[PDB]
Amino acid sequence: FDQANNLLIEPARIEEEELTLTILRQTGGLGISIAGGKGSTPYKGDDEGIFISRVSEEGPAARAGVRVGDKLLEVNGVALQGAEHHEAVEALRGAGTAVQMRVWRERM
């Protein structure tokens, strides 16, 4: 917690966040893993959306700000809402060299 005037209060917290990140592809890709999709087992709760499952440390996505557990909302202006897993795979495989993604980030 936080302390102010001898009172233990709840600290300011970022509950939800929407970030726009730009990953630069390298030899071997973007250095991430995606999980989920419409018709796949949810990665979190009942959410069949696409989430980052692995971020290769000191890799392209690591340097761009990606964090494991982020939900992938758009890639280069193409929204993944309702997309099946493999549709997202080909979207991230064809995003080019610079892959600009808007993600959604939770607290814990």
């Binding site: 991430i32 893993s33 995606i34 796949s40 087992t41 499952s53």
Partner: peptide, 10 residues
């Protein structure tokens, strides 16, 4: 298709 856990590195 099967409703299975799916994960792919990109």
């Amino acid at each position: 298709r099967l409703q299975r856990r799916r994960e792919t590195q990109v």
